[PDB]
């Protein structure tokens, strides 16, 4: 009751859902090739992290307006973010 | 590009409350006017 | 003067790099 | 599909190995016991299924005509050497051909269908793996599928 | 994170043969070095 009262008075909230709104999560492309190698494909690697990770991303992901490409890090909307973690996860279990 | 936000702006609120016709501009008014009361002064924010 | 040289080194070197079995590895 | 007769008869010889009362029947878990040493890989899950099945009868024994037709059951289903390399592949992080034997240790006890340690000291002692250093995935897999 | 505990360690190793090249374990750095292992493999195992 006090977090929720002392966020009403703060408006955190109102930034959190304008953020959402748009694009809040930021993944680098490093970064996301560390984090998705497994749902990377050996096939699409190459020396370039950037056209082969946006290429994976394409496939796994349909809609374009969910992922926002960019020079250094790709972002995104609130939904993908779960959905790949689920798909690394069933994937990695599913071999193991 | 950021064309999908916006900016959501509070400004007119601010507007409304310190500029003229704001509760605070009419209350400098009472006190300045002799009859300078508080169901004048709030009878007068409701309508203004 | 030896903790100055390495004072910048052992980050990037030590965690931030990604050992494989402005930029500094366990090599360097 | 019919299968071959020798084929019949080595599964046969499997089951006499391990059949304790020599009737042709045996529990559940010596006929995994026997379906993985038969060098076929069946999930725990389909292992699950296959029990449930044979409990529907309520005998708990496995008869050999009924172990016959598991044995076709599981020819239907053929994995491929490739999709095994391509797995260890995934867990090949560092991509130089080998993989660490501690990490993979942590997986085999941490993760879905945990067995028991003693099986992964069981996998370290006979795949010759060294402790702590990098074992390669494509050997491990070779000798694997030479059965 | 667990997965940054064999890097740490493999680093660790790959020191103290670079000290044995030098053949310096009289030395005395690897008692400097315990606390780093002792987080290390405390990270490592399991704590359930």
Same mark, same amino acid.
């Given at each position: 009751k006090r977090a929720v009262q002392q966020l009403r008075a703060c408006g955190v909230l109102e930034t959190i859902r304008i953020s959402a709104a748009g694009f809040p999560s930021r993944w680098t492309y490093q970064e996301f090739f560390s984090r998705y190698r497994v749902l990377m494909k050996q096939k699409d690697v190459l020396g370039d992290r950037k056209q082969t990770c946006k290429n994976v991303l394409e496939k796994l992901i349909l809609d374009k307006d969910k992922y926002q490409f960019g020079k250094t890090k790709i972002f995104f909307r609130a939904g993908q973010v779960a959905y790949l973690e689920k798909l690394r996860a069933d994937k990695l279990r599913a071999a193991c | 590009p950021w064309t999908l936000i916006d900016f959501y702006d509070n400004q007119p609120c601010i507007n409304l409350i310190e500029? @003229?016709? #704001?509760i605070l501009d009419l209350l400098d008014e009472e006190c300045k006017?002799? @009859? #300078?009361?508080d169901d004048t002064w709030a009878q007068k924010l409701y309508n203004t | 003067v030896l903790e100055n040289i390495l004072q910048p080194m052992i980050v990037s070197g030590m965690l931030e790099h990604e050992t494989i079995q402005g930029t500094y590895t366990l090599d360097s | 599909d019919q299968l071959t007769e020798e084929q019949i008869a080595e599964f046969k010889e499997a089951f006499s190995l391990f059949? !304790?009362?020599?009737?042709?029947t045996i529990t559940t878990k010596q006929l995994g016991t026997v379906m993985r040493s038969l060098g076929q890989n069946p999930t725990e899950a389909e292992l699950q299924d296959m029990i449930n099945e044979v409990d529907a009868d309520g005998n708990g024994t496995i008869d050999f005509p009924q172990f016959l037709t598991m044995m076709a059951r599981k020819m239907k289903d053929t994995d491929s050497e490739e999709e095994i390399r391509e797995a260890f592949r995934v867990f090949? !992080?560092?991509?130089?051909g080998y993989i660490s034997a501690a990490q993979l240790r942590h997986v085999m006890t941490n993760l879905g269908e945990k067995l028991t340690d003693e099986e992964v000291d069981e996998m370290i002692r006979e795949a010759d793996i060294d402790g702590d250093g990098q074992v390669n995935y494509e050997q491990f897999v070779q000798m694997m599928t030479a059965k | 994170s667990w997965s940054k505990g064999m890097q740490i360690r493999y680093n660790v190793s790959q020191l103290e043969e670079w000290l044995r090249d030098k %053949?310096?374990? %009289?030395?005395?750095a690897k008692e400097t070095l315990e606390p780093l292992i002792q987080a290390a493999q405390l990270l490592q195992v399991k704590k359930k």
């Open positions: - | 500029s @003229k016709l #704001g006017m002799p @009859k #300078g009361t | - | 059949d !304790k009362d020599g009737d042709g090949d !992080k560092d991509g130089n | %053949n310096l374990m %009289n030395s005395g």
